[PDB]
């Protein structure tokens, strides 16, 4: 149940003492370690050639948030605002009004990525699969204002990444 | 370059004035390193290669480095140069002036005599025409210490060992 690390008495056999002194004087263990690093030298390096080569990723990856649309072209978001509630960082700000047609369409869907923790609770909460974190992890900006994403920005992100987002959802919806 | 040795000797005197002006220890230590390096040059010019490297390796390399070690750990001084406050600046300038007066009275007047008689002729004259063959007179004589100077070796070694003892006894508090 318990193992004794260390706790090993040294044998005082003259041969054993001789080998121990040989290790001390001839620096055997240091040579052993040196050989280990030399072996590491002749291995194949594990560096990928960024950005020409990208690291492995799974379909469940969570990244840039994106607002999706139905195949007809109507925004899936029906302004339930439960994604706003579930958001543990209070990053989503949703304001909705009855559209000219009469449906629940948000007039404001603002998420500050600078406050979002990329948890993924929003996509798990949405009952129409509207807000789904996309696959894009490389969206660094130079100004803080850019991080704060408007509803228009989210819609454009959805339109840009829709193919991949839909493919990933199709590849993962069964697990969810 | 016939008077190179004289130039070196003058620079040696200048450095001695520099560190003898008692400046800030750090600046003085340099005044001594410079003079020490010059003196090594003079010794080399006379042919004492081993002795020239002796002062460079021991005096400049170790003796003055341990001196600097102390000045660095016990640093309680306001840094100042040789041309700083008049106490050091005036002393440095006056020493240089005395040396220059000696030089002028030595070159313009061949037989300069202050306390000893000096001749203004270039030091190259004093060099002796002779061949040592496959020999290093300096090296051979110094190596003879182990053969001829056994007594010197004994006394010097005992002095060194007792010096270690004394240093510890003094710096035990």
């Amino acid at each position: 149940t318990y193992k004794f690390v260390n706790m090993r008495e040294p044998s005082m056999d003259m041969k054993s003492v001789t080998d121990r002194a040989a290790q001390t004087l001839l620096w055997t263990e240091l040579v052993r370690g040196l050989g280990m690093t030399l072996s590491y030298l002749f291995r194949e390096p594990a560096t990928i050639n960024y950005p020409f080569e990208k690291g492995p990723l799974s379909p469940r990856f969570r990244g840039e948030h994106a607002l999706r649309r139905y195949p007809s072209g109507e925004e899936r978001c029906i302004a339930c605002k439960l994604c706003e509630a579930v958001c543990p960082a209070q990053a989503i700000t949703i304001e909705a009004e009855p559209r000219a047609d009469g449906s629940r369409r948000t007039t404001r869907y603002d998420i500050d990525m600078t406050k979002c923790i990329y948890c993924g609770f929003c996509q798990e909460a949405c009952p129409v699969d509207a807000i789904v974190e996309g696959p894009n992890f490389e969206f660094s900006t130079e100004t803080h204002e850019e991080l704060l994403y408007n509803k228009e920005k989210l819609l454009n992100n959805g339109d840009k990444w829709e193919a991949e987002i839909a493919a990933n959802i199709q590849a993962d919806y069964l697990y969810r | 370059t016939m008077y190179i040795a004289f130039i070196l000797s003058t620079i040696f005197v200048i450095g001695f004035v520099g560190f003898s002006s008692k400046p800030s220890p750090i600046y003085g230590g340099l005044g001594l390193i410079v003079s020490g390096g010059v003196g090594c040059g003079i010794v080399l010019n006379f042919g004492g290669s081993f002795l020239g490297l002796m002062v460079f390796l021991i005096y400049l390399g170790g003796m003055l480095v341990v001196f600097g070690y102390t000045t660095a750990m016990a640093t309680e001084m306001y840094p100042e140069v040789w041309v700083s406050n008049k106490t050091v600046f005036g002393a440095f300038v006056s020493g240089l002036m005395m040396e220059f007066c000696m030089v002028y009275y030595a070159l313009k007047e061949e037989e300069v005599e202050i306390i000893f008689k000096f001749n203004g002729l270039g030091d190259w004259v004093i060099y002796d025409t002779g061949d040592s063959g496959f020999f290093s007179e300096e090296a051979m004589g110094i190596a003879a210490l182990y053969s001829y100077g056994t007594w010197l070796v004994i006394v010097t070694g005992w002095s060194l060992l007792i010096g270690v003892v004394v240093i510890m006894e003094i710096t035990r508090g």
Partner: protein, 309 residues
């Protein structure tokens, strides 16, 4: 033409140091399963140039030096001594042939120590002085053992002439005769250049250019010390008609020794000041003294006293 020789000794060494930086980066990376600089130029061949240009354009900050005078002399001394130490080295023919070249090398290393003291003292920084004094202590212990080992190995050379080492090691490398001294000598060289595991991580006040020159001087000293080890122990065949053979073999040996310097750097944890000095005073020094006794007695008892001339 002699000035041409001086330039052909100085400039190539500096370029070699510049590329040694890249070589070290790549070697350490590939020993860490990483690719060293590979983007800046083909295989990173332009990396040292990029580093130099960036350094000589970075805003130099002033470190409130108590004595600019001294703060500026320290880099000059380090670089000049590093350049000078290469002069007596016999690549088969030395630039300046000294009967006592070995002692000249030792003296030059001894003066180099001052650069450390001057840098810390003039830096006006308590931590700087402390670290500088630690460097003084480290180089203090190496010099004793280094001198003893050098004397003991030269007891079979017959003089302090560096060129004679080639003749002495004509048939057999000196290492096969004095391998324990070789081990202690290599470790002492590591200690001298503060190469790991004898570093004291955590003259930093130097900014850009000054720092760059101190770095260059240190790495040139690394290469020079490895060359000294090569000439001392790893003798090379010299054909008087074709010296290029000796030059090639010697260069290869020096490169191997520098590669071993990097290989040790990324193989072992750094020592502690107490441990480093309890090595260079209580393990190496007694053994060096005993081996010096042995290397004095051996030529006499074996009638193998080398020729004086």
């Amino acid at each position: 033409m002699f000035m041409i020789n001086i330039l052909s000794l100085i400039i190539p060494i500096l370029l070699a140091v510049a590329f040694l930086t890249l070589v070290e980066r790549k070697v350490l990376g590939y020993m860490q399963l990483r690719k060293g600089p590979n983007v800046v130029g083909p295989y990173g061949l332009l990396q040292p140039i990029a580093d130099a240009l960036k350094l000589f354009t970075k805003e130099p900050l002033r470190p409130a030096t108590s004595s600019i005078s001294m703060f500026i002399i320290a880099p000059i001394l380090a670089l000049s001594l590093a350049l000078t130490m290469w002069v007596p080295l016999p690549m088969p023919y030395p630039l300046i042939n000294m009967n006592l070249g070995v002692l000249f090398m030792l003296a030059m290393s001894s003066l180099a120590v001052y650069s450390i003291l001057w840098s810390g003292w003039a830096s006006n920084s308590k931590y700087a002085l402390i670290g500088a004094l630690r460097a003084v202590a480290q180089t203090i212990s190496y010099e004793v053992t280094l001198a003893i080992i050098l004397l003991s190995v030269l007891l079979m050379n017959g003089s302090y002439t560096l060129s004679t080492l080639i003749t002495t090691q004509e048939h057999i490398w000196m290492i096969f005769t004095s391998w324990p001294l070789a081990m202690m000598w290599f470790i002492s060289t590591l200690a001298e250049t503060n190469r790991a595991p004898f570093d004291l991580t955590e003259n930093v006040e130097y900014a850009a250019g000054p720092f760059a020159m101190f770095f260059m001087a240190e790495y040139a000293n690394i290469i020079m010390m490895n060359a000294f080890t090569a000439i001392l122990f790893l003798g090379a065949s010299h054909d008087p008609h074709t010296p290029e053979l000796y030059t090639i073999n010697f260069v290869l040996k020096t490169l191997a020794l520098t590669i071993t310097f990097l290989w040790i750097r990324a193989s072992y944890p750094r020592f502690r000041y107490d441990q480093l000095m309890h090595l260079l005073w209580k393990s190496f020094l007694p053994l060096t003294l005993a081996l010096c006794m042995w290397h004095i007695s051996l030529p006499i008892m074996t009638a193998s006293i080398p020729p004086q001339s």
